[PDB]
């Protein structure tokens, strides 16, 4: 699944 960092979702 996507991962969230600092409010935004990304693959890695």
């Amino acid at each position, epitope marked *: 699944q996507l991962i969230n960092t600092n*409010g935004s979702w990304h693959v890695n």
Partner: antibody
Amino acid sequence: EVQLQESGPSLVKPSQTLSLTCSVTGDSITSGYWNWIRKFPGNKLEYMGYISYSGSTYYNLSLRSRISITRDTSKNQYYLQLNSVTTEDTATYYCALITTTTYAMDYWGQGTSVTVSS
Amino acid sequence: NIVLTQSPVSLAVSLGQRATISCRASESVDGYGNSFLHWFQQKPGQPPKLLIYLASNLNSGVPARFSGSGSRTDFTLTIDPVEADDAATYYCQQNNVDPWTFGGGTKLEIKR
């Protein structure tokens, strides 16, 4: 089947620290994103932040300086601390989980009132 | 900062009729081909309940009288046919642009 429940003082004095706990049952806090949200007397909802399954955190910039979200996986609980509160921090506080099934805040506690007042 | 604008501020609908509520974002809430825009229902004394996730998907336990559509910046929630249990305030929420926010709410009143 996951359940969340907020607890902690209903009254905090201006300038002190507000602390709440979220107790989680029927799943483990080492998967998902574990959030706090609050609803002002005027009814507006404000997102506060999360601690994720890895221990990483995300805080609303409006609060980043005063907030901390932590966890204890041996108790399956996570915690909010909000420093230096004012009467503007009176609200109903909720914990909620986001899973990657929906990427949305999909399970919520019933919420707990915290009033900040002398 | 990103804002979500809901309209109308409130509306009154007869039983069996259709309610349409709008949520417009000031910038795109899409990423990875998803729109990170969700809809909640909230009634007094209760937490928000998730109705629609990623703009158009019904959550489990929500009836197909609810639907959402839209992408990027413009979104709609429709309730059709409305029922008495639908008297509540509805909110949109976006969780892909810092800071995460909710719309201001739209209150649905049921005529009788």
